[PDB]
Amino acid sequence: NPLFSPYKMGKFNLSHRVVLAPMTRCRALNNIPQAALGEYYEQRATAGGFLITEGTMISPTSAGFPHVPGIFTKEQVREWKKIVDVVHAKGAVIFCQLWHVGRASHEVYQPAGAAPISSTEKPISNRWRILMPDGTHGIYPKPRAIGTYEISQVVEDYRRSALNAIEAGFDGIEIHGAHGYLIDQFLKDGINDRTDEYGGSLANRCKFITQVVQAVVSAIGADRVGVRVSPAIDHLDAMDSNPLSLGLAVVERLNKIQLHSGSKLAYLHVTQPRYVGSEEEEARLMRTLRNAYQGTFICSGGYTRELGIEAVAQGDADLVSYGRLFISNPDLVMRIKLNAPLNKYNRKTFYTQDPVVGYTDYPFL
Ligand SMILES: NC(=O)C1=CN([C@@H]2O[C@H](COP(=O)(O)OP(=O)(O)OC[C@H]3O[C@@H](n4cnc5c(N)ncnc54)[C@H](OP(=O)(O)O)[C@@H]3O)[C@@H](O)[C@H]2O)CCC1
Ligand SMILES: NC(=O)C1=CN([C@@H]2O[C@H](COP(=O)(O)OP(=O)(O)OC[C@H]3O[C@@H](n4cnc5c(N)ncnc54)[C@H](OP(=O)(O)O)[C@@H]3O)[C@@H](O)[C@H]2O)CCC1
Ligand SMILES: Cc1cc2nc3c(=O)[nH]c(=O)nc-3n(C[C@H](O)[C@H](O)[C@H](O)COP(=O)(O)O)c2cc1C
């Protein structure tokens, strides 16, 4: 089973290639990491396995889900340290995903009920609704378009949060540049209607992600920085007219950062769409991004045991991250190794607040 051949991801000797994908679960009440998160990540940690946390706030304006953890305060750092410690005690590597939602927010999630920020004033359409704190679904509002100075202050929020993650003991951070969130609102030409230096051409649309990655690289070192993108995922009305071209343009900037800095990033992590031909066209897009990128490639999106084995065997990825199956299978790594049955997951408790129910009570083998 090639998922169980070891992989050297920079300094890290991973014993297998099954990665915990970042998953928002909304148990970090009032944005403070809770003891429940420690139990949840501990359950999933394995010796030599790699875990990526749920998206974590970089500032007070960065959230668009309830009870998502932050890492922008020293209080949040103290609580994250306890979780990192239990994960490291099991021999796992753990990165903190840094997440800003941009326009995918609501007055209820913003300080003083202010408008969310974006590259544009265009809102997400009414075909998508936002989960509210009371469990109902609400309307995405019109965001405020930010200027070049405010962009630099958002970049500084990423930098400070990356420093805080390292203070908490994380092995590194992942930049969430996917799924229609802030960075993707600058990348995708279906959203970014700017006429300044952050809009228009591929180079201008890639400016923001380049600036974010450069700032965190210069703060903590390229080896402790991964980057996640999703050029062909259309979530939250975030489409590009040419996803393969956009993806390659991002890869070009990442390769250039590495050459200029003198060091490789930890990895490029790409989520692909899954449609139920499209599967071959999408596989060729993924393989082309992998081939173009100078370093470690993590694939994600709809992977199963069989598809993960194929991705590694065929050279299409170095590591394979799993989301939904890892929600319901704390021992997913072992189940994949043994080709054991998998527990069904309960979508109704993906984003609820109970510290146990639908969170840590899915059974082991
Ligand atoms: N912070 C973030 O970055 C967030 C990322 N998210 C991403 O947003 C997108 C939309 O998420 P979703 O929960 O609204 O939809 P999705 O998980 O893709 O499934 C939509 C329907 O298609 C079903 N589906 C069963 N397999 C498949 C399959 N391979 N492919 C796409 N659909 C499938 C799927 O069945 P499940 O209940 O999950 O079994 C579901 O009923 C996804 O790409 C998701 O990964 C969630 C929100 C937080
Ligand atoms: N061990 C598992 O089953 C796992 C499922 N997983 C996912 O967990 C989620 C929860 O499962 P669910 O029962 O709540 O939803 P679903 O799998 O879509 O099936 C709903 C009902 O339709 C039934 N069903 C099933 N396949 C059919 C069919 N081809 N035609 C018609 N009816 C069908 C199915 O019967 P089974 O329990 O599978 O025997 C079930 O009663 C699903 O998204 C599932 O994809 C994770 C992987 C392992
Ligand atoms: C409940 C849930 C929450 C998620 N939260 C995040 C998130 O915080 N950050 C992110 O980059 N992706 C997030 N994702 C996307 C997953 O990381 C991953 O790409 C997707 O689940 C992989 O597909 P799979 O579920 O078929 O393995 C989330 C997915 C789900 C289902």
- Catalytic residue list contains 181: yes
What 3-state DSSP class applies to 187? helix
Residues with CB under 6 A from ligand 2: 341-342, 344-345
Q: Closest by alpha carbon to 227, among 201, 264, 199, 262? A: 264
Torsion of CA 336, 25, 362, 342, to 10 degrees: -30
Q: How many CB atoms lie within 10 A of CB 284?
A: 12
What single string gives the DSSP state of each residue in 37-66? Answer: HHHHHHHH--TT-EEEEEEEESSTT---ST
Alpha-carbon distance of 247 to 304, in angstroms, equals 24
**Structural domains of the chain ordered from first start:** 1-365 (3.20.20.70)
- Give, for ligand 3, the residue of 3, 23, 67, 267 to mutate: max count of ligand atoms closer than 8 Å to Cβ: 23
Helix, strand, coil % (nearest 5) of the chain? 40, 15, 45
Rounded to the nearest 10 degrees, the angle between the axes of helix 74-89 and helix 35-44 is: 30
Ligand 2 atom closest to Cα of residue 345? 8
Q: Which ligand is nearest to the CA of 276?
A: 1
Q: Phi and psi of 147, rounded to 5°?
A: -90, 180
Alpha-carbon distance of 184 to 192, in angstroms, equals 9
Q: Phi and psi of 248, rounded to 5°?
A: -65, -35
Residue with tokens 């939904």: 324
Alpha-carbon distance of 361 to 115, in angstroms, equals 37
49 is in an annotated binding site: no
CA of 322 to the centre of ligand 3 (A): 8
Alpha-carbon distance of 63 to 59, in angstroms, equals 8
Cβ atoms of residues 314 and 348 within 8 Å: no
Torsion of CA 90, 95, 97, 98, to 10 degrees: 130
Q: Closest by alpha carbon to 261, among 215, 229, 293, 296? A: 215
Check residue 70 and report its DSSP letter: B
